[PDB]
């Protein structure tokens, strides 16, 4: 891949992906405010590098999310666009190591680092199935 | 509220709390296998907080996550029990701290930090209106 480059990451968010969205099971999240779930924005950040590391992947070969470190300081009603910015921090055999930030235009509404690692899709899915009840 | 003092939260995870089902706008996540998605952890994290520091907030009060600083080591199916353990690590003003971790029966799953500020539920509604397109 490459160290050092930006990838960016636009998407409106849309009404069903505010706090009582993320958790529709929740009590306490039915009356937050409608704004942008910071479990959404995370995931976000996340899909924004997935698409950032498709291209190197080998055929059959896919990542998780080990770690996610960032703030969630501003607020984000849906219609906004949120923009995540992704850069590579370090590679280390099947280990990312992202910087991420995201904006929705008018605030900068979070930052920090995001760990991937790079997995075998069929035997992670194998794997996870001895799990399964 | 006090510090040290610990709040469990259990959950079953149902199938829609997968990574397909965080985002199905993606392309990118609709191969993913059906494992609970590291956004819904966050989330689900940030509800035990919720609901353990519930009996802090005054009338017309609410809270805001505003930082999530954790990892995610262990992949978790449907049908899995993931038990949050927050434990309340300070609390300084509008500002409450948390060490979170995540147990799914089997393995831990993931832990870290989850940082919360109490807000002004109506001036904070004003605020975001203020953002709304």
Same mark, same amino acid.
């Given at each position: 891949?490459?160290?050092?480059? $930006?990838? /960016? =990451?636009?998407?409106? @968010?849309?009404? =069903?992906? #505010?706090?009582?969205?993320?958790?529709?099971? &929740?009590?306490?999240? *039915?009356?937050?405010?409608?704004?942008?779930? #910071?479990?959404?924005?995370?995931?976000?950040?996340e899909?924004?590098?997935?698409?950032?590391?498709?291209?190197?992947?080998?055929?059959?070969?896919g990542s998780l999310g080990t770690?996610?470190? @960032? /703030?969630? #300081?501003?607020?984000?009603?849906?219609?906004? /666009?949120?923009?995540?910015? *992704?850069?590579? $921090? &370090?590679?280390?055999?099947?280990?990312?190591?992202? $910087? @991420? &930030?995201? %904006? !929705?235009?008018? !605030?900068?509404?979070?930052?920090?680092? %995001?760990?991937r690692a790079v997995i075998?899709?069929?035997?992670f899915?194998?794997? @996870?199935?001895?799990? /399964?009840?």
């Amino acid at each position: 891949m490459r160290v050092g480059e $930006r990838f /960016t =990451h636009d998407f409106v @968010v849309p009404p =069903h992906k #505010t706090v009582r969205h993320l958790y529709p099971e &929740s009590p306490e999240f *039915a009356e937050f405010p409608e704004v942008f779930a #910071t479990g959404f924005m995370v995931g976000l950040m996340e899909w924004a590098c997935v698409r950032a590391m498709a291209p190197y992947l080998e055929p059959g070969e896919g990542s998780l999310g080990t770690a996610i470190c @960032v /703030t969630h #300081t501003a607020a984000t009603p849906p219609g906004l /666009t949120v923009t995540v910015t *992704a850069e590579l $921090r &370090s590679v280390e055999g099947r280990r990312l190591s992202w $910087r @991420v &930030s995201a %904006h !929705d235009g008018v !605030d900068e509404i979070g930052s920090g680092t %995001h760990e991937r690692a790079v997995i075998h899709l069929e035997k992670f899915n194998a794997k @996870v199935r001895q799990k /399964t009840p």
